[PDB]
Amino acid sequence: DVVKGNFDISKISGDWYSILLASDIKEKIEENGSMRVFVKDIEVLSNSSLIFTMHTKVNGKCTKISLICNKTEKDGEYDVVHDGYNLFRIIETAYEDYIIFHLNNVNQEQEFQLMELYGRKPDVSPKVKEKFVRYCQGMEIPKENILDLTQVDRCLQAR
């Protein structure tokens, strides 16, 4: 059951897996890029803040990190500081299957977007993935800038 607004944030908590990653600047999400991090779980706090626990590669090793995201004034939007100021929202979710987040990173040099699909399981339906691709094309992210992480190291081994 697919939700596209009025998200019930309580239902996005718990464990997720990073499945697709996309950006309008490809380097951001390729190996070594600052945005190539692999979600573990999302914790929702009493003040509506969210804590993303994730893994990133540090000298070849999966290292746990924690991202604090705060609700902005604007509805559905969150901000988080990581390699700049990021504003993000939920595009779509089936709470027990997948979720798609859109993010704008603002920085002195060049704004970029990210799009990410997480699954409750390590993989999701190829239909869902195609739907993520079309959302990306609508946002001027070309399909060549869309990485599927199911057959690469995404720190599953460190979870």
Residue numbers in the entry: 6 to 164
From the paper:
Lipocalins are characterised by a common tertiary structure exhibiting an eight-stranded, antiparallel β-sheet closed back on itself forming a continuous hydrogen-bonded β-barrel.
For the final model, four rCan f 6 molecules consisting of chains A to D were contained in an asymmetric unit and had nearly identical structures with an average root mean square deviation (RMSD) of 0.63 Å for main-chain atoms. Two regions with high RMSD, Leu50–Ser53 and Val111–Gln115, are located on the extruded turn and exposed to the solvent. For Leu50–Ser53, chain C exhibits an alternate conformation due to the lack of hydrogen bond(s) between the Oδ/Nδ atom(s) of Asn52 and Oγ atom of Ser54. The high RMSD at Val111–Gln115 reflects differences in packing environments among the four molecules. All other regions are superimposable among the four molecules in the asymmetric unit with low RMSD, indicating that the four molecules have essentially the same structures. The estimated molecular mass was 19.9 kDa, indicating that rCan f 6 is present as a monomer in solution. Hilger et al. modelled the tertiary structure of Can f 6 and Fel d 4 in silico based on the crystal structure of Equ c 1 and showed that these allergens share highly conserved structural characteristics as well as amino acid sequence identity. Consistent with these findings, the X-ray crystal structure characteristics of Can f 6 remarkably resembled those of Equ c 1.
